[PDB]
Homo-oligomer: A and B are copies of this chain.
Amino acid sequence: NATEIRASVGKMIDGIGRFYIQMCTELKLSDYEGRLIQNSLTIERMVLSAFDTGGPIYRRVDGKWRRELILYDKEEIRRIWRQANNGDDATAGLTHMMIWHSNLNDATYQRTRALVRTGMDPRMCSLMQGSTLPRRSGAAGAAVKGVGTMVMELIRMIKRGINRRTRIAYERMCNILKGKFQTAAQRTMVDQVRESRNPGNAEFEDLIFLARSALILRGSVAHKSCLPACVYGSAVASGYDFEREGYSLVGIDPFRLLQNSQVYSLIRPNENPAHKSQLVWMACHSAAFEDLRVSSFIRGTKVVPRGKLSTRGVQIASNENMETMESSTLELRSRYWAIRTRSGGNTSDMRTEIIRLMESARPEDVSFQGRGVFELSDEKATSPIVPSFDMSNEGSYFF
């Protein structure tokens, strides 16, 4: 059923577009200045703030870039927003940029300080997908969350409490949690946790276990390709009428759109452009915890690890100066595309059950058997391509 799902989400994409265009028309920005991922970000956040303000806005004068600090009627923003969505709320829409930000943050930063202070192992990076994503996120907003993400929450919710209506949350938060797991025991053990009203260290220690079980017996976590507002604004302005022509966040749509996007970015004096583009590209698909090998394979070019990456962050801090600042054109095109999946793959004390399953598991264990990559011409999911990694690679752990 390509009617609702493909076209209803198109309608949510149209809104973001239209809005971005309106909002650019207010700031009286130029074309080059509306394609500046920097300005786009600021706008996106102005809105999510107002629906739950001012921000940094960069301008282009003969030669150099001028940063403007501006403020807008928090309500005016809310007004312009609905105008674009037919006076609707389109929570989906706000939630969408709510994720684009997430996926950018899960790739720009490593959230160790928080994991440890929670009592999670810092090496549990690949499980913190969407830890930045405000709880306000929608129902299809949490589905993108990693197993580890959920645990950091419950553990804090529990840690302060064990240190009224709050209950329905906890059970559900677990049901979701449990719905991440895709194996008997995994599933069953979550229940054994959800049994206690005042779950103390008993649980505190057990979920942490299950957290680690997912490192081997992963769960189902959806990935959503959420592009910057400018990309959708520009597309809408170019005539693309997505609600009519349909759009996806896990199909070929997002890659294809990024195959023509003209996004620019501010870039510090010593930073590497190629390295900058990489970053953004990984935020456009929630590939911050993907196997670098595959990311590079699909990308078309080296996908260098975080450490070796030359950049501190896409947003420009108030600290920096504009004199020594310039801007490059972001390389967001990719070689092939792939169905962003949700599945994690698979081959007494319920712990034992898992520990026993954990064991038989080898890192070499092939997942998504038969699934492959698609050419950018292959609109339909017709012919798949299987990658062979016998190759001089460059790692697998972005972090």
Q: Which residues of A contact B (CB under 8 A)?
A: 164-165, 167-168, 171-172
B-side contacts of A171, CB under 8 Å: 164-165
Q: Which 7 A/B pairs are nearest by Cβ-Cβ distance?
A: A168-B168, A165-B171, A165-B168, A167-B168, A164-B171, A167-B167, A165-B172
Tell me the minimal C-beta distance from A235 to chain B in angstroms: 23
Centre residue among A167, A168, A171 by max chain B CB count within 10 A: A168
Closest Cβ–Cβ distance, residue A190 to chain B (whole Å): 14
Min CB distance, A244 to chain B, in Å? Answer: 14
* Cβ–Cβ < 8 Å partners of A168 in chain B: 165, 167-168
Instruction: Kindly state the separation between the CA atoms of A167 and B166 in the bound complex, as whole angstroms.
Output: 12
Tell me which residues across on chain B come within 8 A of A165, comparing CB atoms: 168, 171-172
Residue on B with the closest CB to A86? B86
Of all chain B residues, which has the CB nearest A168? Answer: B168
Q: How far does the Cβ of A198 sit from chain B's closest Cβ, in whole Å?
A: 14
| Least Cβ–Cβ distance between A358 and chain B, in angstroms | 30
Question: In the complex, what distance in Å separates the CA atom of A172 from the CA atom of B164?
Answer: 11
CA distance A168 to B166 in the complex (A): 10
A164 to B167, CA, bound (A): 11
Q: How far is the CA of A164 from the CA of B165 in the complex (A)?
A: 14
- The smallest beta-carbon distance between A261 and chain B, in angstroms, is 31
Residues of B within 8 A of A164 (CB): 171
Give bound CA distance, A171 to B168, whole Å: 11
Contact partners of A172 in chain B: CB under 8 A: 165
Q: In the docked arrangement, what's the CA distance between A171 and B166, Å?
A: 12
| Minimum distance in angstroms from A290 CB to a CB of chain B | 35
Nearest CB on B from A339, distance (A): 29
Report the minimum CB–CB distance from A164 to chain B (whole Å). Answer: 7
- A364 CA / B171 CA spacing, docked (Å): 51
A167 contacts across to B, CB distance below 8 A: 167-168
A174 and B27 alpha carbons, distance in the complex (Å): 50
CA distance A202 to B293 in the complex (A): 65
